[PDB]
Amino acid sequence: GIDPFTMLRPRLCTMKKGPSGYGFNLHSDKSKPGQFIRSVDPDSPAEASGLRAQDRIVEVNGVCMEGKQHGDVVSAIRAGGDETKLLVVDRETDEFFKKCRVIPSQEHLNGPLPVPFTNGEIQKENSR
Numbered sequence: 001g002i003d004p005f006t007m008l009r010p011r012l013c014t015m016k017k018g019p020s021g022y023g024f025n026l027h028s029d030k031s032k033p034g035q036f037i038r039s040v041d042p043d044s045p046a047e048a049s050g051l052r053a054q055d056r057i058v059e060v061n062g063v064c065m066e067g068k069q070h071g072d073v074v075s076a077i078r079a080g081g082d083e084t085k086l087l088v089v090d091r092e093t094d095e096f097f098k099k100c101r102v103i104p105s106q107e108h109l110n111g112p113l114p115v116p117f118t119n120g121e122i123q124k125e126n127s128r
Contacts, residue, residue: 006112008096010058010104013049016083024051028070034058035065035073037088051086056094058104059087066103 015022023044026035035057040046057065057073061080065073077084089097089104097104102114 008093010089011050013086015045015049055088
């Protein structure tokens with residue numbers, strides 16, 4: 001809808017090996033797990049696919065890598081073949097997901113994001 005916060009949604013980056021590889025660098029954080037975009041090359045399929053800096057890898061090739069290690073994620077990317085699809089979330093987007101305890105995925109891409117407060121609504125509390 002026309003919600004001012006409905007823009008807090010992830011993006012699916014689809015990138016094929018251009019020259020002889022891809023053009024981005026991942027950084028593994030020593031406190032928080034997951035691969036974050038350290039830097040991306042503007043003249044590569046990575047930037048074209050929508051690989052924003054400081055964004056975190058959530059899914060790769062349709063596989064969710066929340067809680068996975070550096071080797072697991074990287075090996076999955078390499079096992080994608082000539083191209084790979086990365087799912088990333090912005091700082092604002094990820095903070096939104098954090099506060100709602102929601103894990104970003106492909107469905108949230110074109111979805112109107114999770115419902116506020118997760119549940120709420122004590123509608124017809126009969127409990128009989």
